[model samples]
Target: EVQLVESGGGLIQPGGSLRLSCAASGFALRMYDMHWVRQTIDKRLEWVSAVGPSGDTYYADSVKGRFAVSRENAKNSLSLQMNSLTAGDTAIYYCVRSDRGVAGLFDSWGQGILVTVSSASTKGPSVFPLAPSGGTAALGCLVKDYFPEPVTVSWNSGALTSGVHTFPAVLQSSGLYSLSSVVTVPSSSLGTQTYICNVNHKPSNTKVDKKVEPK
Candidate 1:
């Protein structure tokens, strides 16, 4: 059985540095290439750096200077070190193996690790009422100006799942991130119950709750 395991990922403040390791088994480390790949919070996959069998190395333009990769054939391990961290660097880092040092021909992968670069600044969500239409009332939750962009938006403590739509986080011009979640319910039910929009962010361990009711 072939397996690659990655370690050393967690929250890091801006301007900090981190070194991650990928341990390989079931194959010869010096015969195959190892790559450091990451998936952004926005769901974009990016390749960072790579190491070849002959101790050769390659890096992507985005992380060429601040990121480095190396390997130890005796230990069958690969390492990735990054410095000058920023909120944009928050991602799920993975270790991938390529056959015969072939690029874009990844054959093995490690369970990715989550890395978050955060700042002291944090923001909560704001819930607002929307005009009712066709016997249905809608509410919108606006979350913005937050760092280290992963967040969760839920309705009524997850009791109400349907009719809720949460959008992916979008980077703003201010260097922060923002997103919106909207929920709709029957107008008749609004008179008997209140709806709550919950926003949870992990970096700061913050949760914001906003409730709306019929006018």
Candidate 2:
């Protein structure tokens, strides 16, 4: 059986650094490409870095200049080093096997390891509705100027899950962060109900509720 197990994770203060390891079995690290992927607390997935079979390296724009990947083919182990921790860096990381060293064809994934970058800043969210298309309408929540970007957005007491998506947080030039989330609902019900946008800022220990009625 093929296995990819990732290790080394813990709470790290801002400006700190860490080195994570991935141990692979039943496969040769020199024969395939290995990628490092991460999932934030809000379930947003990001490809962090990768190393190809030919030893060429790849990195996501978000992690460029701060992340590095290396390997020991004889030991079947891969190492990922990240420096300068921030609240936005909190995530569960995994080691993925890229079939034939291809970029998109991921054949296997490590169980994943959770890493947290401690933070203390908080910000509220705003709500708005988009134009109705077909039979459905999208409601949007904008959360900005937050630190430790692990926030959650919910719609109407969890009434909407199937049509909800939360985008990754973006770092602004001002050194702050912003995020967007959307929930789609039936157009016919848009005008009749008051939709609530629930924003949970985990680190700051606060929650904000914004209401919107779309016609």
Candidate 3:
């Protein structure tokens, strides 16, 4: 079985720095390329960057200045670093791998690792409000560190109570997996509502919820 493991959850303060790891085992590190991905509350997949066992790197244009990926050939591990962390940087971070020619496409991923940035002693839950017109909204979650596993997506609102809204196959590149959900909220249910994104993975279960209201 192919396996990718990542660093456990941790807390980072504003303006601080942080680093996370994704190590591959059961397979030769040089046989695959490792990539990093960021999943926000909207579930949109943002390609962070990729690195090979040989020490080469490729970063997304938006993240070129702030992120870096490095490898440890001796230990078969990959590391991702972000400088000057901020609230906008908080989200589930993951490490993934893909075969040659599929560099950005992750085929195997690590278990989802939660990273939070906060000034308060405790990390409070996030409350996302809806606009006045009850416009479209997106919620996202990541299936970290585990690739080649069946994953699903779901959403709920006042009218559409709860269930799978859409089932999009996890896209793999450079050894990672990512999926997302988008739902349009009717004006009738604008003020009072909540949206949830859930992921089903072994050993660790996770979910993210957002409350909607006009900004």
Best candidate (score: lDDT)? 1
lDDT of each: 0.82, 0.79, 0.61
Candidate 2 positional error at 151, Å: 19
- Screening candidate 1 with a backbone cut-off below 3 angstroms (N, C-alpha, C), the clashing residue pairs are none
Please give, for residues 1-215, the per-residue lDDT of candidate 2 as tens digits. Answer: 78999988765778889899999998989889899999986789999999976668889998888888988888999999989888788899999999873666778999998787764444443334433346877877777777655678888778867888889888777655688788777877866767777888765666887776564
lDDT of 1 at 45: 89
Write candidate 1's Cα lDDT for 45-161 as tens digits: 898899987789899988888888999999999999989988788899999998773676778889998887876565544434443345777776787777655788888889988
Candidate 2: where is the Cα deviation over 4 Å? 119-215
Tens digit per residue, CA lDDT, model 3, 134-165: 34543333334333233444444334534324
Number of residue pairs clashing in candidate 3, backbone atoms closer than 3 angstroms, sequence gap of 3 or more or interchain: 25
Point out where model 1 deviates above 4 Å. Answer: 1-16, 23-31, 39-46, 53-56, 72-77, 84-92, 100-103, 109-133
Q: Which is the better candidate, 1 or 2, if ranked by TM-score?
A: 1
For candidate 3, the 10 contiguous residues with the lowest summed lDDT are 122-131
Rank list by lDDT: 1, 2, 3
> Roughly what TM-score does model 1 have, to 2 decimal places?
0.72
TM-score of each: 0.72, 0.55, 0.55
